[PDB]
Design a protein around this ligand. Structure first.
Ligand SMILES: [Mg+2]
Ligand SMILES: [Zn+2]
Ligand SMILES: [Zn+2]
Lengths: 73, 1335, 99
DNA sequence: TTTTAGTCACGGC
RNA sequence: GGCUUUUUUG
DNA sequence: GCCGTGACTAAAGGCAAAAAAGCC
C-alpha cells in the first residue's frame, strides 16, 4: 500500500540514506523479533518500515540509540 | 579482502613457484578409456583429481583420505575444483622471446635497447647475427652481422669478439646491460643536445629506464625461459556425442609447442648439425608466438577449418573476449523475457505479469512460504506440489507478490529510464502487460517488441527499486526538466475531442449548477459533449501562505471542459482546462501540477487523464475514411498554370536567352512555389467548415474532419504528412542529392504511376540505409562517452572557489537560439550579480537559481549572469555539489554520491539516433545600435568607418537586452552612430563581399615611390578594357633580387611626413602584395577610407569528431603571443613571422605558407589568439591560446548548435562534464622545485595536489599547461589499468602497465564492477566512505 | 521464457543462454550503466555476484530465501578469477594485495 | 572499405 | 557444448 | 644535417533475441 516515497525522502536528507536506514530497520524487523511500531495492513517488511520513517518515529539516530541501549544489556 | 590490484612481470622463479608439476608429454587423454594421461596437458598428478575425493587409481577415496597423497597413482586426494586453480609449467629447451613486448605499438625491446624493431625481428628469426661482446675489435656492441659477415669477421679477430644468434643472444645482451648507468648518460646527453625530434625519444627512454629501475623488474625477465600452463578446467575437453571429442583451440597450440620443444630437446642432445638446430629453434619460436598471440606476425596458423585459431591474447581482446562478455555484462538468473502488450486498466506503478512467468520467476520464494505453513515438509514435496499446480499455490503466489517489485527492461537501454521497477499484477496469458504512459520512456511500440523482467532478492535491492527505480519516482528526464509521462496518441485525441466547442449543438446556452450536472446531461443525452454553456465552478488557489482558499464564479465554457474539470486537483486554476488541450498543452498542464502540488497529486492526475482520455476517445468513434482526405479543387488548375510556366522556359531555353543551369534553377523555383501554393490552399480548405448557427445564418467554425483532428491535436502526424496525403508530394531528390526537375504531382489519395513511384523510392531507400547504418555508429559513440567519464562522482558540498564561466544568451545573427533564462536555470552564481546600477547586489553569491528567481531575473531584465561550472571546480578526484548545480531528474540540489558522469554520457548519447549520417546586414525589428570594443572614425563624407577587428553589432530595446549580433571586416560602413535608437528594416552595414579592399588609413595625397619600370612593375594596358594603370606583376618574371623589393606605399600627410596618429609616429607603409591592380591614378582625390586596389583571393560524425577533438583537414592559423607584428628573412619554404613583446625577449619564430590567405598586415598590432588565416578552428590551438575557460564554451556551443538544429533539447551542463574529462592531463614545462620532468605529462589533479601542498610549506611550486585529449585517448591514459584494459587495446595497456609495475587501487566505477564490489556512487557511496575512513 | 535456477556453463559458471538450454537473460553493459545512473549499488552487486557466477554466494542465497531471510554475501565472482589465471597464463603477473 | 593515429624511411636547402 | 556461416524480429 | 614530408603498419567500427545448418 505504498505508491511513492516523497514523504520519507523529505523526512531524511537524501534518498540513499533513506534506503540504508529503511534496509537496516527492515532487517531488524524481519530476521528476528522487533515488532513494528505501526499497525501493519498485510504489508511486506520493506513497506512497513518506510511508513515508520514517514511518521517521523524512525531515522538513523533513533536506530543507533536503540541499538546502543539494547547492546548495553 | 584486497586493497588493490598490482601488476608486474613474472620471474622464472615465480613461474616455477606457481606451478605444481612439469608438463612433458603432448598426449592429452588416453582416447581409449575415459582417463587422462600421465604428465600430459590434462595430467591428474600435476593439476588434480578428476573426481571429488577420488584418486586416479582408486586406492584412496572418501573424506578419510583427504589431504593424503596416494602413492599408487601419485595424485593427492582433494576436491576437484582445484583443477580450476593449480597451474603447470613447461621448461623450454631454448630461450624464447615474448611476442607482446617485442611488437606492441611502441616496441619495449626497441626502446630499452635503443634498437630499431626491423633488425631485431631479423635477429630473432635466425637470419642475421648480432654482436654480444665487441671486446677490443673493430665491431660495436649493437652491431648486426649476417652469415657471410660473421664468417669473414670470425677468422680476422678469432674469439676476441662474441656474437650469438636469436633469443639467446637477446637475453645475453639484456642481462649484461646496466640500467642506472645508461639512465645517467641518457640524462647527461639530454641536457646537452637540443633536438625536438630527439627530445621526445630521450624522454621516453629515460622514463622507461626509471620505471624499470624503480620497479623490481629486470630486462632478462622479458625473455621467456619457462612457460606457464593454463589450468585444464578453463580449457575443458568436454565429451560430445560420438567418438570425437570437443577440444578448444588452445589445446592444439599447447600440443604444438610441447611437441616442438620435445623435438628440439631430443635433437640438440644428439649433437646434430647447426643447420637443423637453427631451423628447429626458429620453428619453436614461431609456435610460441602463435600460442601467445596468433596473427600479429603474419599468416596465422589454422586448423582443419582453415580458420585462425584462438590464442590467449585473442581470447581477451575483442567483443567476444572475457572483459566485454563475461565481466562487464553477464547472464543472470531470476529473469524472463516476453512480448509486451498494452493494458489501459493499470496504474502507473503496476505491470501485468503472466501467471506462468510469475510462478517460474518466484519459485524460491514460494518454497519458503509453502514449508513455513506446513503444507510441505521436505523441499522435494514442495517441488512436487508446485509442478502439479495445486489451488493453494495460487493463493501463496498472490501473497508473495504483494509489494515485491520487478525490474522491467528493454534492449537497447539507451538511457536510465530503460530499466524501471514495477509492482507486478498476476494476469492470464503469456504477454507482459505494460502501462501506456511509460511507453514514451521505454521507446517501445506494440508491434512485436520484447522486454525482460528481473527480480530483486535482498531487502536492500527491493528498497532501492521502490525508492529509486519505480516509475512513480521517474517522471522527469535526467537530460532536461521536461516530463516523461506526457500523454500521446490515443489520449490526446480523446482530450482534444472532449474540450472543443461547436457553434451549434444539442442543449446550448443552458446554465448548470456545477460540473457534476454536466456529466448527468451528457450521459442522459440531453446535451452534446461540447455545447457552450454557463456553469458554476469552485476553484481553489494557493495564493495564501501554502493554504487553499475557495472561490466561486460563473464561467462560460462547454460540457466537455466542465466534465474534465472533475478530475483536475485542487490547486490548479480553471484557465488550464478551458483551451483545446492539444498535445503540447496537456503536458504543460501536468507540468503545472508538478510545480504546485508535488508528486502524488501529479501521478493521480496523470492516471485520471489517461482514463478519461481513453474513455472519451472510445466514445467519439473517430475514424479515417477515403472521403476524409479532402483534395483542394483549385489544385489541378494550379498545376496546369505551373506547367504553363515551364512551357515558357523550355521555349526560352531554345532561343538562347536561358542557359542550362539557370533553366534548372527557374524550373525548381517555379515548382517549389506551385507546391507551396497547393499546400496552402489545401490547408485553408481542410481547416474550416460551414455550419448553420442557432439564428439560421451560416457561420464558419474550425472543422471536425478526422484527419485534421489527428494532425492539429498533435496525436499523430504533422503538416508534411497531411500535405502528402492531399497536396502534391513535391520535388524528389536523386540518390546523389540532385533534385529531379519534374516533381511528383500526385498525392497518395489518388494513384501514382509507375515512373513517379520509382523515383519516390530513391529517398526511401536512402533513409532506410542511413537508419540501418546509423545505429552502429551512434551506440559506439555512447560507449566512448561512458568509459571516459565513468568515474566522476559528486564528493563535496561546496569547493569554495570563485572561478566560473561567463554565461550569456547565444546569438547567431538572427533570433536568439536560447534565452539566458534556460542557460542559467538550476545553477549557482560564482559571485554576486551586480545590477547595472552601481553597487547593487541583485543575486547573493553561492545561491541556487530556480524558476522563482529566474522570473525575478526576467522582470528586472538582467543582461548576463556569471555561474559556476564543473570544468572550473577545484575539487580533487571529483566535483562538488554546488559547481554541478541542480539535479534535473529530482528538482532539488544534487546529493553527495550521485554518479553524474554516466548520466551525462547517456544524456549526450541517447539522442544520437535522431541525427543523420549524411553582402549586407539588415535589422529585423526595433532596437538601438550598440557596438562593443568599437573604434570608428568619421570619414570625409561623414560616414563612420570602423578600424577595430572585434566590433560587435548589438540591438538594444527599451529594456536593455540584445537580440542581434553581427561581425564586420576592416573598414566597415555605418549609416548611423553609436547609442542611437534606430528602427527596423534599415540597412546600416554594406561592404564588398568577394574583393578585399586595399583602403588607406587617413586622408592625404598618395605618392608613388620605389617604382621600377621594365622588370618589376609595368604599365599593362589590357586590350579587354583598354585602360592604362599601374599594375603589380606576378612572381614568375621577377627573381629573388626583385621579389625582395617590397613596394611600400608610405602613408603621408599634406606635409609629406609620417602620419601623426595619436600615440605612435611609425610610418604606415602599405606593402603591395602580388596580383595587385591599381585602378586609381595620381592626382585623383581619395575619400577617407576609400579603396586603393581590389585584391582578389555533418551531424553524428561531426559530433563524434568534435568530442574526439580531431584535427581539421585545413586548420586555421592564429597568433601565438601578443605584441607587434614583425617579419624577417623570407622564401625559406614558408613565410617568417616574429612577434616582439613590450619588454620580454622575442626568440620565437614560426612559418606560415605565403601561398595561403593572409588577413593581417605589418602595420597592425595583433593580440594573442587572434585569427590570421581562415577555416575550421582546431581545439588544441584555441586551448593553448585563449585558455581553458574558452575551449569549454566553444565545444558546448558547437555541439548544442548541432543538437538544436536537429531539434533535440539537452542541458548544457551534461556537455561540460565530458569536457572536464578531456582536460584531465597537464604538460609540465618547468621542473622548478618539484619532482616532475620538464617534458612529461602528469595528471592535473596529481600536479595540483603536489603543488598546493608543497607551496604551503617553506618552498615554491611549479608551472604547468593543461592539455586537451580526445575521449578515445583520454580514456586509455588513466591512472587505472583495469578500466583502460577493458575498453580498447588490451594488449598495449597490459604490457605498458606491466613494464612500469603499476597498481590499481579501485577508485572508479567500472573497476569496482569488474571486481564485484559496491560501486562508490549512490547507495554504495556511504559504505565506501566508511571503508576509506577506517583506512 | 523464464528461469529461476537452471544449468550453468562450464568455464565461467554463468547461466546458459537461449530458450532451448533454459538460459537466463543477458544483463549487458548498457544495463550496468543504467543501474549506475541511479544510486543502485546493492542491485548491481546482486546481478553481478549472487545471481550470475558467485558459486559460493548463490548456493547460500538460495538457502537464505527458502529460510525466509533476504540477505546476500558479496563473495567473489568466478568470472574474474579465471581472467587472472588467463593473464597469469602469460608472462604477466597480476595479483591481489593484503587486507 | 574507411578512418585514424603512430612509426620508419626519404628529402631539400 | 563450444565455434562458424546464413535467415528473421525489435 | 635537421625539421618537413611520404610511405608502412596496427586498431576499430551497436545492443538483445530467436530459427536453421555444418565441424570439432
Ligand atoms: Mg517496434
Ligand atoms: Zn591413488
Ligand atoms: Zn566546486
Amino acid at each position: 500500500a505504498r505508491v511513492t516515497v516523497q514523504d520519507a525522502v523529505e523526512k531524511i536528507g537524501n534518498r540513499f540514506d533513506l534506503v540504508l536506514v529503511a534496509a537496516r530497520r527492515a532487517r531488524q524487523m524481519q530476521v528476528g523479533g522487533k515488532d513494528p511500531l505501526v499497525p501493519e495492513e498485510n504489508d511486506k517488511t520493506t513497506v512497513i518500515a518506510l511508513r515508520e520513517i514517514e511518521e517521523g518515529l524512525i531515522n538513523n539516530q533513533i536506530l543507533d540509540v536503540r541499538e546502543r541501549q539494547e547492546q548495553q544489556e | 579482502e584486497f586493497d588493490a590490484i598490482k601488476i608486474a612481470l613474472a620471474s622464472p622463479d615465480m613461474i616455477r613457484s606457481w606451478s605444481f608439476g612439469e608438463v612433458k608429454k603432448p598426449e592429452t587423454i588416453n582416447y581409449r578409456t575415459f582417463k587422462p594421461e600421465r604428465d600430459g596437458l590434462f595430467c591428474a598428478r600435476i593439476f588434480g583429481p578428476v573426481k571429488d575425493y577420488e584418486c586416479l587409481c582408486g586406492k584412496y577415496k572418501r573424506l578419510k583420505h583427504r589431504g593424503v597423497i596416494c602413492e599408487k597413482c601419485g595424485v593427492e586426494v582433494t576436491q576437484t575444483k582445484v583443477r580450476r586453480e593449480r597451474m603447470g609449467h613447461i621448461e623450454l629447451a631454448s630461450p624464447t622471446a615474448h611476442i607482446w613486448f617485442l611488437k606492441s605499438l611502441p616496441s619495449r625491446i626497441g626502446l630499452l635497447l635503443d634498437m630499431p624493431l626491423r633488425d631485431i625481428e631479423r635477429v630473432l628469426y635466425f637470419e642475421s647475427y648480432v654482436v654480444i661482446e665487441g671486446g677490443m675489435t673493430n665491431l660495436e656492441r649493437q652491431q648486426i652481422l649476417t652469415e657471410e659477415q660473421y664468417l669473414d669477421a670470425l677468422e680476422e679477430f678469432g674469439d676476441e669478439f662474441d656474437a650469438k644468434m636469436g633469443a639467446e643472444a637477446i637475453q645475453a645482451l639484456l642481462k649484461s646491460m646496466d640500467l642506472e648507468q645508461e639512465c645517467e648518460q641518457l640524462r647527461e646527453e639530454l641536457n646537452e643536445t637540443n633536438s625536438e625530434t630527439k627530445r621526445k625519444k630521450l624522454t621516453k627512454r629515460i622514463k622507461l629506464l626509471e620505471a624499470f629501475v624503480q620497479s623490481g623488474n629486470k630486462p632478462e625477465w622479458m625473455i621467456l625461459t619457462v612457460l606457464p600452463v593454463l589450468p585444464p578446467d578453463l580449457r575443458p575437453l568436454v565429451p560430445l556425442d560420438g567418438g570425437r571429442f570437443a577440444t578448444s583451440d588452445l589445446n592444439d597450440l599447447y600440443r604444438r609447442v610441447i611437441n616442438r620443444n620435445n623435438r628440439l630437446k631430443r635433437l640438440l642432445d644428439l649433437a646434430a648439425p647447426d643447420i637443423i638446430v637453427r631451423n628447429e629453434k626458429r620453428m619453436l619460436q614461431e609456435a610460441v608466438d602463435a600460442l601467445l598471440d596468433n596473427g600479429r606476425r603474419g599468416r596465422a596458423i589454422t586448423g582443419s577449418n582453415k580458420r585462425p585459431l584462438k590464442s590467449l591474447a585473442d581470447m581477451i581482446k575483442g567483443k567476444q573476449g572475457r572483459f566485454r562478455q563475461n565481466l562487464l555484462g553477464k547472464r543472470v538468473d531470476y529473469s524472463g523475457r516476453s512480448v509486451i502488450t498494452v493494458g489501459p486498466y493499470l496504474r502507473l506503478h503496476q505491470c501485468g505479469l503472466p501467471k506462468k512467468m510469475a510462478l517460474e520467476l518466484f519459485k524460491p520464494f514460494i518454497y519458503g512460504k509453502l514449508e513455513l505453513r506446513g503444507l510441505a515438509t521436505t523441499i522435494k514435496a514442495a517441488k512436487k506440489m508446485v509442478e502439479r499446480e495445486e489451488a493453494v499455490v495460487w493463493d501463496i503466489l498472490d501473497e508473495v507478490i504483494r509489494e515485491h517489485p520487478v525490474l522491467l527492461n528493454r534492449a537497447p537501454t539507451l538511457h536510465r529510464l530503460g530499466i524501471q521497477a514495477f509492482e507486478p499484477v498476476l494476469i492470464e496469458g503469456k504477454a507482459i502487460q505494460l502501462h501506456p504512459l511509460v511507453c514514451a520512456a521505454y521507446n517501445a511500440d506494440f508491434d512485436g517488441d520484447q522486454m525482460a523482467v528481473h527480480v530483486p532478492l535482498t531487502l536492500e535491492a527491493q528498497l532501492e527499486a521502490r525508492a529509486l527505480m519505480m516509475s512513480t519516482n521517474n517522471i522527469l528526464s535526467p537530460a532536461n526538466g521536461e516530463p516523461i509521462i506526457v500523454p500521446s496518441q490515443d489520449v490526446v485525441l480523446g482530450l482534444y475531442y472532449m474540450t472543443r466547442d461547436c457553434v451549434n449543438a444539442k442543449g446550448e446556452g443552458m446554465v448548470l449548477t456545477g460540473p457534476k450536472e454536466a456529466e448527468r446531461l451528457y450521459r442522459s443525452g440531453l446535451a452534446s459533449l461540447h455545447a457552450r454553456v454557463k456553469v458554476r465552478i469552485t476553484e481553489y488557489e494557493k495564493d495564501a501562505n501554502g493554504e487553499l482558499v475557495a472561490k466561486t464564479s460563473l464561467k462560460d465554457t462547454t460540457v466537455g471542459r466542465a466534465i474534465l474539470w472533475m478530475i483536475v486537483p485542487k490547486g490548479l486554476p480553471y484557465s488550464i482546462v478551458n483551451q483545446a488541450l492539444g498535445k503540447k498543452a496537456i503536458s504543460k498542464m501536468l507540468n503545472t501540477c508538478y510545480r504546485i502540488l508535488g508528486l502524488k497529486p501529479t501521478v493521480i492526475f496523470a492516471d485520471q487523464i489517461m482514463y478519461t482520455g481513453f474513455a472519451y476517445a472510445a466514445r467519439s468513434g473517430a475514424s479515417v475514411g477515403i472521403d476524409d482526405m479532402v483534395i483542394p479543387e483549385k489544385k489541378h488548375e494550379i498545376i496546369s498554370e505551373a506547367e504553363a510556366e515551364v512551357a515558357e522556359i523550355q521555349e526560352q531555353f531554345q532561343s538562347g536567352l536561358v542557359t542550362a543551369g539557370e533553366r534548372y534553377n527557374k524550373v525548381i523555383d517555379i515548382w517549389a512555389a506551385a507546391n507551396d501554393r497547393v499546400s496552402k490552399a489545401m490547408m485553408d480548405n481542410l481547416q474550416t467548415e460551414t455550419v448553420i448557427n442557432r439564428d439560421g445564418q451560416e457561420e464558419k467554425q474550425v472543422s471536425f474532419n478526422s484527419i485534421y483532428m489527428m494532425a492539429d491535436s498533435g496525436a499523430r502526424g504533422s503538416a508534411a504528412q497531411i500535405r502528402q496525403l492531399a497536396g502534391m508530394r513535391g520535388l524528389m531528390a536523386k540518390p546523389d542529392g540532385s533534385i529531379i526537375e519534374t516533381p511528383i504531382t500526385a498525392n497518395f489519395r489518388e494513384g501514382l504511376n509507375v515512373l513517379q513511384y520509382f523515383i519516390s523510392t530513391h529517398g526511401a531507400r536512402k533513409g532506410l540505409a542511413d537508419t540501418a547504418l546509423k545505429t552502429a555508429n551512434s551506440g559506439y559513440l555512447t560507449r566512448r562517452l561512458v568509459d571516459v567519464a565513468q568515474d566522476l562522482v559528486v564528493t563535496e558540498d561546496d569547493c569554495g572557489t570563485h572561478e566560473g564561466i561567463m554565461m550569456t544568451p547565444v546569438i547567431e545573427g538572427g533570433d536568439v537560439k536560447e534565452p539566458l533564462r534556460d542557460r542559467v536555470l538550476g545553477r549557482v552564481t560564482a559571485e554576486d550579480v551586480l545590477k547595472p546600477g552601481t553597487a547593487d547586489i541583485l543575486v547573493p553569491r553561492n545561491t541556487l537559481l530556480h524558476e522563482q528567481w529566474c522570473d525575478l531575473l526576467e522582470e528586472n531584465s538582467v543582461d548576463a549572469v556569471k555561474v559556476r561550472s564543473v570544468v572550473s571546480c577545484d575539487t580533487d578526484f571529483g566535483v562538488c555539489a554546488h559547481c554541478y548545480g541542480r539535479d534535473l531528474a529530482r528538482g532539488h540540489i544534487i546529493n553527495k554520491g550521485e554518479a553524474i558522469g554516466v548520466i551525462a554520457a547517456q544524456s549526450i548519447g541517447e539522442p544520437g539516433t535522431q541525427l543523420t549520417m549524411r553582402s549586407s546586414i539588415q535589422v529585423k525589428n526595433k532596437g538601438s545600435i550598440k557596438l562593443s570594443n568599437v573604434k570608428s572614425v568619421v570619414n570625409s563624407s561623414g560616414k563612420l568607418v570602423i578600424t577595430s577587428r572585434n566590433t560587435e553589432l548589438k540591438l538594444i530595446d527599451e529594456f536593455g537586452r540584445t537580440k542581434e549580433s553581427y561581425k564586420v571586416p576592416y573598414g566597415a560602413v555605418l549609416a548611423k552612430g553609436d547609442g542611437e535608437q534606430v528602427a527596423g528594416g534599415e540597412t546600416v552595414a554594406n561592404w564588398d563581399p568577394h574583393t578585399m579592399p586595399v583602403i588607406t588609413e587617413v586622408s592625404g595625397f598618395v605618392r608613388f615611390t620605389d617604382m621600377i619600370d621594365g622588370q618589376t612593375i609595368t604599365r599593362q594596358t589590357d586590350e579587354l578594357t583598354g585602360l592604362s594603370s599601374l599594375v603589380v606583376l606576378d612572381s614568375a618574371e621577377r627573381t629573388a633580387g626583385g621579389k625582395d623589393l617590397r613596394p611600400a606605399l608610405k602613408i603621408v600627410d599634406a606635409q609629406g611626413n609620417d602620419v601623426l596618429i595619436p600615440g605612435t609616429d611609425m610610418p604606415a607603409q602599405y606593402f603591395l602584395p602580388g596580383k595587385a591592380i591599381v585602378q586609381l591614378e595620381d592626382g585623383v582625390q581619395i575619400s577617407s577610407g576609400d579603396t586603393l586596389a581590389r585584391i582578389p583571393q555533418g551531424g553524428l560524425p561531426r559530433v563524434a569528431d568534435l568530442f574526439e577533438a580531431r584535427r581539421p583537414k585545413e586548420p586555421a592559423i592564429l597568433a601565438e603571443i601578443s605584441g607587434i607584428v614583425s617579419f624577417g628573412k623570407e622564401t625559406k619554404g614558408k613565410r617568417r613571422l616574429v612577434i616582439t613583446p613590450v619588454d620580454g625577449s622575442d626568440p620565437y619564430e614560426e612559418m606560415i605558407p605565403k601561398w595561403r590567405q593572409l588577413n593581417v598586415f605589418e602595420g597592425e598590432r595583433v593580440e594573442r589568439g587572434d585569427v590570421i588565416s581562415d577555416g575550421p578552428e582546431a581545439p588544441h590551438d584555441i586551448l593553448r591560446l585563449r585558455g581553458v575557460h574558452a575551449v569549454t564554451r566553444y565545444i558546448v556551443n558547437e555541439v548544442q548548435d548541432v543538437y538544436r538544429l536537429q531539434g533535440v533539447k539537452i542541458n548544457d551542463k551534461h556537455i561540460e562534464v565530458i569536457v572536464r574529462q578531456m582536460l584531465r592531463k597537464a604538460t609540465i614545462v618547468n621542473a622548478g622545485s618539484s619532482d616532475f620532468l620538464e617534458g612529461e605529462q602528469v595528471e592535473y589533479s596529481r600536479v595540483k595536489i603536489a603543488n598546493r601542498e608543497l607551496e604551503a610549506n617553506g618552498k615554491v611550486g611549479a608551472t604547468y599547461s593543461r592539455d586537451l585529449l580526445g575521449i578515445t585517448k583520454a580514456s586509455l591514459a588513466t591512472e587505472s589499468f583495469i578500466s583502460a584494459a577493458s575498453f580498447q587495446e588490451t594488449t598495449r595497456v597490459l604490457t605498458e602497465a606491466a613494464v612500469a609495475g603499476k597498481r590499481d587501487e579501485l577508485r572508479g566505477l567500472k573497476e569496482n564492477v569488474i571486481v564485484g564490489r559496491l560501486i562508490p556512487a549512490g547507495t554504495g557511496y556511504a559504505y565506501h566512505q566508511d571503508r576509506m575512513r577506517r583506512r | 521464457h523464464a528461469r529461476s535456477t537452471g544449468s550453468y556453463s562450464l568455464v565461467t559458471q554463468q547461466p546458459l543462454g537461449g530458450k532451448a538450454q533454459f538460459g537466463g537473460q543477458r544483463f549487458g553493459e548498457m544495463e550496468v550503466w543504467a543501474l549506475e545512473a541511479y544510486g543502485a549499488a546493492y542491485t548491481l552487486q546482486e546481478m553481478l555476484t549472487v545471481k550470475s557466477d558467485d558459486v559460493n554466494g548463490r548456493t547460500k542465497m538460495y538457502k537464505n530465501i527458502v529460510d525466509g531471510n533476504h540477505q546476500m554475501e558479496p563473495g567473489m565472482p568466478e568470472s574474474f578469477n579465471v581472467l587472472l589465471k588467463e593473464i597469469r597464463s602469460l608472462g604477466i603477473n597480476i595479483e591481489l594485495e593484503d587486507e
